[PDB]
Design an enzyme around this catalytic site. Structure first.
Site, PDB file in Angstrom:
ATOM      1  CD  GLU A  45     -31.917  42.376  17.889  1.00  0.00           C
ATOM      2  OE1 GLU A  45     -33.258  42.094  17.514  1.00  0.00           O
ATOM      3  OE2 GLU A  45     -30.766  42.135  17.123  1.00  0.00           O
ATOM      4  CG  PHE A  50     -34.788  34.959  10.889  1.00  0.00           C
ATOM      5  CD1 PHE A  50     -34.408  36.366  10.688  1.00  0.00           C
ATOM      6  CD2 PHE A  50     -34.543  34.869  12.405  1.00  0.00           C
ATOM      7  CE1 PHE A  50     -34.551  37.340  11.375  1.00  0.00           C
ATOM      8  CE2 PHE A  50     -34.566  36.078  13.411  1.00  0.00           C
ATOM      9  CZ  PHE A  50     -34.593  37.259  12.682  1.00  0.00           C
ATOM     10  CG  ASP A  99     -41.912  39.360  14.976  1.00  0.00           C
ATOM     11  OD1 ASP A  99     -41.451  40.400  15.535  1.00  0.00           O
ATOM     12  OD2 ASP A  99     -41.451  39.207  13.662  1.00  0.00           O
ATOM     13  CE  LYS A 155     -36.245  38.987  18.785  1.00  0.00           C
ATOM     14  NZ  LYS A 155     -37.126  39.378  17.811  1.00  0.00           N
ATOM     15  CB  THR A 164     -32.503  37.000  16.993  1.00  0.00           C
ATOM     16  OG1 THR A 164     -33.413  37.564  15.898  1.00  0.00           O
ATOM     17  CG2 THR A 164     -31.700  38.472  17.176  1.00  0.00           C
TER      18      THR A 164
END
Ligand code: F6R
Length: 320
Positions: free
Chosen positions: A98, A180, A17, A134, A158
């Protein structure tokens, strides 16, 4: 004797990440994920000062007729893609990029932005199968992913904070979801001014991913469950066996340097598959509203990523 990192790799797809490709190679992750805050962070690192000015010159020279606002949007997407390409150079798998958070409540413009990202990767000679788009898991984002997947464009949904989002994403045939952990733990700690992390069994974020994992496997959903957003290595270790986990270089370093035995906690099974009715828009909105934390963290996530994207635009404008 083996590091926790190497053990985790045998039972879970390890994903890095970060937008800083230089920190990736030494951990040898399969895939990598970026987000708008990670791209902003990278852009502000002195080591990438030139790569940013280069992108500004290339785009600016190849689009002399774009009005100033369109030039900035173009430069911002090329930067996002440039970091993704640098990441793809040092891994064997896929990278997540994203869409602009500002299109989060518009399925049509989410689809458009997604395709522009794919177009820029393709123009740079990158095979489209190496990219995941994303998208924030609002109803509109899920609806866009549904169309994208039907057209063969893989998505990473996400900002997932509730099982209902997760179910709707799986029903849309999304390639991968990113429930998450950390931001949920953040909310839990804020609620009662907790200083220390809760015990793993009581960690709301860890339990959220565990519940989503269990939901997916009992329903036979093929969508990949990738835990994301971590605050400590114990949270990652608690999810060993999950399909995938995306982890910061800081936490990857901790996993690389410790060699205690790793016990798998999440496992697949051969149980009879449950076929449930699909979640309607109205059901989805109701369930999300009942989850105070989820409504707040989804909204906040979109606001915060927007802020970082605007900051990136301002950096571009200050160097145009
Ligand atoms: C994409 C999800 O696959 C990731 O980059 C997430 O945005 C981050 O993992 C979120 O982490 P933070 O909660 O620490 O921003």
């Amino acid at each position: 004797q083996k590091s926790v990192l190497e053990q985790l790799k045998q039972v879970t797809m390890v994903v890095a990440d970060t937008g800083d490709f230089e920190l990736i190679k030494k951990y040898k992750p399969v895939d990598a994920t970026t987000n708008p805050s990670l791209i902003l962070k990278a852009v502000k690192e002195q080591k990438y000062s030139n790569l940013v000015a280069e992108t500004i010159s290339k785009v600016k020279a190849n689009n002399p007729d774009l009005n100033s606002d369109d030039l900035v949007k173009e430069i911002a997407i090329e930067i996002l893609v440039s970091f993704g390409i640098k990441i793809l150079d040092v891994i064997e798998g896929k990278v997540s990029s994203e869409v602009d958070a500002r299109v989060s409540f518009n399925s049509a413009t989410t689809i458009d932005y997604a395709k522009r990202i794919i177009a820029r990767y393709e123009s740079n000679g990158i095979p489209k199968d190496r990219v995941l788009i994303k998208i924030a898991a609002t109803w509109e984002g899920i609806k866009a992913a549904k169309l994208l997947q039907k057209e063969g464009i893989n998505c990473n949904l996400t900002l997932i904070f509730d099982k209902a989002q997760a179910k709707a994403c799986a029903e849309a045939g999304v390639y991968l979801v990113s429930p998450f952990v950390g931001r949920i733990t953040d909310w839990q700690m804020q609620q009662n001014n907790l200083k220390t992390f809760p015990a793993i069994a009581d960690d709301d974020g860890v339990n959220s991913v565990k519940a989503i994992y269990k939901l997916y496997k009992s329903h036979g959903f093929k969508t990949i469950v990738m835990g994301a957003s971590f605050r400590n290595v114990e949270q990652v270790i608690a999810l060993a066996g999950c399909d995938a986990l995306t982890i910061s270089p800081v936490l990857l370093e901790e996993l690389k340097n410790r060699d205690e035995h790793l016990e798998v906690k999440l496992t697949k099974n051969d149980d009879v598959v449950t076929q449930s009715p699909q979640i309607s828009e109205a059901d989805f909105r109701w369930l999300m509203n009942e989850n105070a934390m989820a409504t707040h963290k989804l909204a906040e996530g979109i606001r915060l990523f927007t802020k970082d994207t605007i900051e990136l635009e301002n950096i571009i404008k200050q160097n145009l």
